[PDB]
Amino acid sequence: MASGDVERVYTDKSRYDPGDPVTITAQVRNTDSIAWTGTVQLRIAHLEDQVHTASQTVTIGGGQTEDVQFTWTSPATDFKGYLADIDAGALGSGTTAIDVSSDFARYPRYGYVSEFHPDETAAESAAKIDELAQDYKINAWQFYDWMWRHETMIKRTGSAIDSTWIDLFNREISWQTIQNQIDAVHDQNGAAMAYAMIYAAREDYESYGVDSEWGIYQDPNHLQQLDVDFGNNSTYMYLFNPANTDWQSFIHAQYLDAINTAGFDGIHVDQMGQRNNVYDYWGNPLNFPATFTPFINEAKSTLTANNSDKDRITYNIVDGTVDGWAANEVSGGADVDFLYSEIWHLSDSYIQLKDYIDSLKANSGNKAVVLAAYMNYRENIGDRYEAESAALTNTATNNNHSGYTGSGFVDQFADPGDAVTFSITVPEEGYYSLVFRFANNSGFTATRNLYVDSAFEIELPFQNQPSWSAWSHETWHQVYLTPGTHTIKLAYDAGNVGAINLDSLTLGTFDPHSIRLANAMMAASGATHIELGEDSQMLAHEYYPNRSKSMRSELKEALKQHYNFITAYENLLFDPDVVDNDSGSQFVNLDMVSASGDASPNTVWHQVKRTPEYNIVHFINLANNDNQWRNSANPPTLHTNIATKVYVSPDETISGVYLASPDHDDNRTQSLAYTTGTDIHGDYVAFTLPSLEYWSMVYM
Ligand SMILES: OC[C@H]1O[C@H](OC[C@H]2O[C@H](OC[C@H]3O[C@H](OC[C@H]4O[C@H](OC[C@H]5O[C@H](OC[C@H]6O[C@H](OC[C@H]7O[C@H](O)[C@H](O)[C@@H](O)[C@@H]7O)[C@H](O)[C@@H](O)[C@@H]6O)[C@H](O)[C@@H](O)[C@@H]5O)[C@H](O)[C@@H](O)[C@@H]4O)[C@H](O)[C@@H](O)[C@@H]3O)[C@H](O)[C@@H](O)[C@@H]2O)[C@H](O)[C@@H](O)[C@@H]1O
Ligand SMILES: OC[C@H]1O[C@H](OC[C@H]2O[C@H](OC[C@H]3O[C@H](O)[C@H](O)[C@@H](O)[C@@H]3O)[C@H](O)[C@@H](O)[C@@H]2O)[C@H](O)[C@@H](O)[C@@H]1O
Ligand SMILES: [Ca+2]
Ligand SMILES: [Ca+2]
Numbered sequence: 001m002a003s004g005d006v007e008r009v010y011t012d013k014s015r016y017d018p019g020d021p022v023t024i025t026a027q028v029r030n031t032d033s034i035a036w037t038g039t040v041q042l043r044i045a046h047l048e049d050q051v052h053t054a055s056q057t058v059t060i061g062g063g064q065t066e067d068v069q070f071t072w073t074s075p076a077t078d079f080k081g082y083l084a085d086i087d088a089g090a091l092g093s094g095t096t097a098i099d100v101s102s103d104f105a106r107y108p109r110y111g112y113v114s115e116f117h118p119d120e121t122a123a124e125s126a127a128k129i130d131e132l133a134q135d136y137k138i139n140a141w142q143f144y145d146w147m148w149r150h151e152t153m154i155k156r157t158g159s160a161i162d163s164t165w166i167d168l169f170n171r172e173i174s175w176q177t178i179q180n181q182i183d184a185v186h187d188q189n190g191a192a193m194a195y196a197m198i199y200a201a202r203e204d205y206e207s208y209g210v211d212s213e214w215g216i217y218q219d220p221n222h223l224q225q226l227d228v229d230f231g232n233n234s235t236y237m238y239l240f241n242p243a244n245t246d247w248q249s250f251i252h253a254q255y256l257d258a259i260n261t262a263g264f265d266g267i268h269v270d271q272m273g274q275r276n277n278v279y280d281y282w283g284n285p286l287n288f289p290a291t292f293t294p295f296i297n298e299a300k301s302t303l304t305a306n307n308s309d310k311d312r313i314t315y316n317i318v319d320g321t322v323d324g325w326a327a328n329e330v331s332g333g334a335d336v337d338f339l340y341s342e343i344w345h346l347s348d349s350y351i352q353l354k355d356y357i358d359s360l361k362a363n364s365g366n367k368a369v370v371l372a373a374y375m376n377y378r379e380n381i382g383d384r385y386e387a388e389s390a391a392l393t394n395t396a397t398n399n400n401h402s403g404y405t406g407s408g409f410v411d412q413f414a415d416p417g418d419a420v421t422f423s424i425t426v427p428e429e430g431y432y433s434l435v436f437r438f439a440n441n442s443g444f445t446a447t448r449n450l451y452v453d454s455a456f457e458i459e460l461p462f463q464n465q466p467s468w469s470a471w472s473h474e475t476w477h478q479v480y481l482t483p484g485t486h487t488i489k490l491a492y493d494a495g496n497v498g499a500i501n502l503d504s505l506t507l508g509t510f511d512p513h514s515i516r517l518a519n520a521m522m523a524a525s526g527a528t529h530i531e532l533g534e535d536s537q538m539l540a541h542e543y544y545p546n547r548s549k550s551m552r553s554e555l556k557e558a559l560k561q562h563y564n565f566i567t568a569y570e571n572l573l574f575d576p577d578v579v580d581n582d583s584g585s586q587f588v589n590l591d592m593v594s595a596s597g598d599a600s601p602n603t604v605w606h607q608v609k610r611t612p613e614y615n616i617v618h619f620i621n622l623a624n625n626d627n628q629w630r631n632s633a634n635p636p637t638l639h640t641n642i643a644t645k646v647y648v649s650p651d652e653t654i655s656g657v658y659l660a661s662p663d664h665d666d667n668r669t670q671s672l673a674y675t676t677g678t679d680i681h682g683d684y685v686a687f688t689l690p691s692l693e694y695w696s697m698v699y700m
């Protein structure tokens with residue numbers, strides 16, 4: 001009676017230079033009561049070939065987990081993905097990708113850091129960076145809102161760097177915490193990108209060395225500078241002209257200060273997106289999107305000059321779509337290391353998004369593409385607990401304003417001593433996003449004290465709404481919980497203010513079905529997705545700190561598989577010589593399973609691609625779902641034993657048919673029995689796909 005499982009498999013770096021040693025670690029647990037002794041096998045593949053094998057015998061104590069390590073000298077050829085497979089027999093097996101790349105910008109897998117707390121220890125910094133690297137092969141990190149001011153990024157008193165500073169949303173940021181994270185990025189061979197704006201400065205900028213003449217204005221008479229109003233009569237961003245060389249000088253020196261003082265590898269340059277009828281200080285009207293490429297290219301050569309090992313840069317093409325505002329300009333002319341675009345509502349369907357990605361590749365000579373595409377945005381999804389069915393304390397149920405869910409809500413929630421108290425029951429250990437749906441027409445922000453299992457947690461704000469029947473679910477707070485039952489109590493306490501009605505509490509939950517389909521479509525079209533950060537947090541909103549949704553562990557497990565898959569098969573997905581095969585949907589036939597070539601809803605979408613060495617067919621299962629990438633989705637209709645025919649040239653050479661999927665068998669390639677044939681439609685290759693859930697790739 002011998003038993004156990006392989007819990008985790010990871011490498012010591014997210015990215016290796018050719019010829020670097022790779023340490024591959026299997027975290028193996030003996031679940032038996034007595035110590036196990038046996039052989040642990042390592043098998044490393046590159047696509048369909050087995051390129052290395054290794055063995056060791058190892059003794060693991062009963063109830064213990066032990067790190068089983070192998071070492072491997074990466075082959076000397078650059079830009080190669082590999083799959084490492086550890087097999088411990090009765091104690092299970094596990095895989096991880098190895099990425100050999102001298103330049104991460106060829107295969108960016110971009111995460112984020114948004115938390116810089118003085119109380120973050122260096123263990124905590126390291127652990128969050130290590131988790132993203134080990135689990136999802138993250139090789140670059142966008143540091144969001146690390147800076148003090150948009151124009152004065154590091155806060156100094158004299159020539160001393162202050163220890164902490166307060167950012168635009170009143171968050172305390174530590175310099176040491178930023179540094180420790182940057183260091184930990186660098187121990188993973190990761191690149192640390194420093195968030196910055198192309199053209200923003202904070203209020204009172206004239207006293208920080210920034211001339212108002214450099215600005216951009218809504219009129220010809222410099223009356224009204226373009227700005228972002230944060231709604232408190234002091235906190236503003238003011239905008240400037242990216243073509244102004246005096247502004248370029250000022251802000252490019254900030255970028256350099258950031259590289260040289262903090263150790264950042266480059267700059268993640270952001271912008272607000274489309275602006276019209278923009279003038280400079282003198283009333284000369286600007287072709288605004290044409291000002292970006294010159295700013296970026298000048299920023300790039302200034303970086304390279306400063307430090308050519310830390311000259312990285314990207315620019316956010318906001319509101320991405322084919323021929324979108326600034327899109328052709330940047331992709332076509334800007335010297336960014338990889339392309340980045342935040343997708344809003346002009347590429348809502350899978351096919352529109354595919355076409356946008358294809359266009360970026362075609363303008364750019366196939367630069368890598370990273371998409372910011374905030375999944376399940378605004379949807380109040382998860383387990384719901386209606387407030388009317390909660391335990392009430394000097395509060396009551398009612399239903400005299402519409403917009404509630406269930407049968408009613410709680411009101412008479414306006415006095416110290418009042419409280420609502422939910423009994424939630426959760427399936428597993430981890431983060432839960434407490435999302436409150438509520439009404440407040442008090443004229444101003446109300447507050448309530450949240451308690452969790454009787455202990456105080458935090459004061460929550462509840463913004464004011466136009467009426468008592470306009471509801472909001474913008475009040476959230478994330479908490480970590482053990483499995484089972486827990487007490488979540490909103491309470492009116494002395495020092496809290498306003499009044500509210502409480503519809504419900506939802507445990508904000510990212511939907512795996514939609515997220516696996518989006519990631520599959522993106523990789524299959526040659527793009528990756530910025531979505532993971534911190535300690536397996538996921539972006540819910542464009543303000544990266546927003547924790548209104550949490551991932552459950554099935555989603556974490558599936559993203560681990562997916563990110564490893566797109567690393568191990570990076571050569572069939574992201575190399576510049578990976579191209580759509582001509583023609584369309586008449587190349588591929590699935591017998592008795594409705595199918596499309598164009599991401600038609602409720603179909604198995606097949607997409608044919610080619611390298612000089614390989615023919616690639618992607619199968620993405622949209623059965624039981626629509627053609628929109630963002631919104632939560634149903635579990636796809638599972639398919640089994642699908643008789644497939646792929647039509648080929650007579651020209652084409654074929655000595656095997658190979659199958660890999662992030663949904664099955666730990667990303668391992670499987671060799672499929674096939675036949676060649678000829679019918680009226682042309683020459684074909686015929687095989688059976690054992691199954692199709694979210695995404696499967698065949699190559700030959
Ligand atoms: O999480 C940090 C907070 O933690 C504590 O409080 C937790 C509570 O936070 C909120 O409530 C307090 C909040 O209330 C009001 O704001 C509501 C609003 O807050 C958040 O969003 C803020 C804004 O985010 C963006 O703008 C900031 C962004 O602007 C520039 O960047 C431009 C962006 O646009 C491009 O398209 C880019 O691609 C993109 O990447 C860019 O971000 C700038 O360069 C950046 O530096 C800057 O960060 C967005 O544009 C705005 O629309 C947002 O308003 C929430 O995420 C959002 O859902 C919500 O609507 C109030 O006005 C504000 O002052 C207060 O901070 C939550 O609502 C609440 O649930 C939670 O309990 C702590 O107490 C806080 O101090 C801390 O902030
Ligand atoms: O039993 C209570 C204990 O459990 C949790 O630990 C899980 C979590 O803890 C660490 O991270 C702390 C903190 O790091 C950053 O600041 C992140 O941005 C935050 O999301 C995060 O909470 C650890 O390093 C993580 O790997 C791990 O996921 C609680 O969160 C603990 O505070 C608590 O003591
Ligand atoms: Ca309700
Ligand atoms: Ca959908």
Ligand code: NA
Nearest residue numbers: 590592593594
């Ligand atoms: Na069919």
